[PDB]
Amino acid sequence: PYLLISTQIRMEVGPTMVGDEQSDPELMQHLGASKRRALGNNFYEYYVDDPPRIVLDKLERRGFRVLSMTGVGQTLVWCLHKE
Amino acid sequence: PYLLISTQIRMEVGPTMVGDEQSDPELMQHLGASKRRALGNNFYEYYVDDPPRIVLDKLERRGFRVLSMTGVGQTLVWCLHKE
Amino acid sequence: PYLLISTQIRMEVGPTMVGDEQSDPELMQHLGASKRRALGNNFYEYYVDDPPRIVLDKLERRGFRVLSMTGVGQTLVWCLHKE
Amino acid sequence: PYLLISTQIRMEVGPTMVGDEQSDPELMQHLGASKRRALGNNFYEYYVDDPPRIVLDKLERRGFRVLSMTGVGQTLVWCLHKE
Amino acid sequence: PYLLISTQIRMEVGPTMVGDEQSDPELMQHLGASKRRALGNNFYEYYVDDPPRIVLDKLERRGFRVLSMTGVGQTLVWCLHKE
Ligand SMILES: N[C@@H](Cc1ccccc1)C(=O)O
Ligand SMILES: N[C@@H](Cc1ccccc1)C(=O)O
Ligand SMILES: N[C@@H](Cc1ccccc1)C(=O)O
Ligand SMILES: N[C@@H](Cc1ccccc1)C(=O)O
Ligand SMILES: N[C@@H](Cc1ccccc1)C(=O)O
Ligand SMILES: [K+]
Ligand SMILES: [K+]
Ligand SMILES: [K+]
Ligand SMILES: [K+]
Ligand SMILES: [K+]
After folding, report:
1. Which of A49, A52, D44, E69 makes an SS bond possible with D79, Cβ 3.0 to 4.6 Å?
2. Is D4 exposed, middle or buried (0-12, 13-18, 19+ CB in 10 A)?
3. Which residues pair with D76 in a beta bridge?
4. Domain boundaries, given as residue ranges, for chain A
5. TM segments (chains A, B, C, D, E)?
């Protein structure tokens, strides 16, 4: 149902974080996401190389819509929901 | 009827703050929230170990909808409303 | 019709700013607000000791709805509208 | 059809910026706005002394609705859209 | 389709960034956008000289509506969606 995606520093370029370790594996696979650990983090996260505009387009085809977009520090976050 | 939840530094990992001293004890119990008074604070707060995506999903099953999401400092906040 | 409320540093505790000098005196009285002139300011504002979640609940009973919530600096602001 | 208004430092006091060089002159006149090229700026801007709550009320009477409110630096911005 | 546009420092003046390398070439041509690789960037971006209010008006004529507006660092971002 709810989904959070994000990008840092610039909105025109990836990586875009598209999930946490408990994310839907089917949706992560559909987006072409990989599990990667950022340096100075103990847990893996899902990410794609695509900029966020492309991820939003792909999520819409899976029935997700944007409820909110916000900036926090140097991170741009989108909150999406499936009916 | 209104609910404020938040997480700091990273959106994919908890803790997620889910209430203040005057929060609904039953809803706090339903979420599995722990009550605590953080270091140097003169008030209590409820929190869960879950990342905020999981808390948003649980709140929807209780009739809460996301009205807004915003960043402030290093905190990502959601404002929810019950039907 | 429009109303702006805010809180600083933490969302769980007040004070909550609920009005400027030209605010509706009856609504300020209904909320239990007091006037205060902050240090170095040439204007007074209305505030309550309650955390913002409690103010939002009171404002809903007066016909106000949340249109937006945003963070700016260390301030969390809500924009409300009456129909 | 789109309108951007803003205020800095505090939401309770003006000035409120209500337009750029290409704004509707009649709407600027209706709001009682003045032109003022500011220090460190090349462009002109329209502004009023009123706090933003009063400008939002006046804009509603002209058919504008608030679509979004956000913070950026020390600026609080509203994005409005005509019906 | 989703669209992300942005401006920095001041909302009244351009440039307005209107696309990434994979943006719709026809829409970029319609807006009169140019490609520009910023200092020390590994990618190109599309931009126009117009302030964002004018770009929002042009995008509405192409069927785009503003879903959200947010501040992140010194950047004001709009998230748009076509019907
Ligand atoms: N730590 C991130 C901001 C952030 C906070 C909370 C959740 C998500 C992201 C930054 O400085 O860019
Ligand atoms: N103090 C929080 C920001 C904040 C302000 C107001 C209310 C809630 C949170 C931070 O720096 O992360
Ligand atoms: N001055 C406030 C931010 C703010 C800006 C504009 C309007 C309202 C509040 C702070 O630093 O917390
Ligand atoms: N420069 C503004 C922030 C801002 C950025 C982009 C557009 C509008 C305003 C400030 O520091 O308050
Ligand atoms: N780097 C931008 C903020 C930003 C972060 C993420 C995406 C887009 C923009 C700034 O400091 O103004
Ligand atoms: K990025
Ligand atoms: K966290
Ligand atoms: K507070
Ligand atoms: K101000
Ligand atoms: K600009």
Report:
1. E69
2. buried
3. D7, D71
4. 1-81
5. none
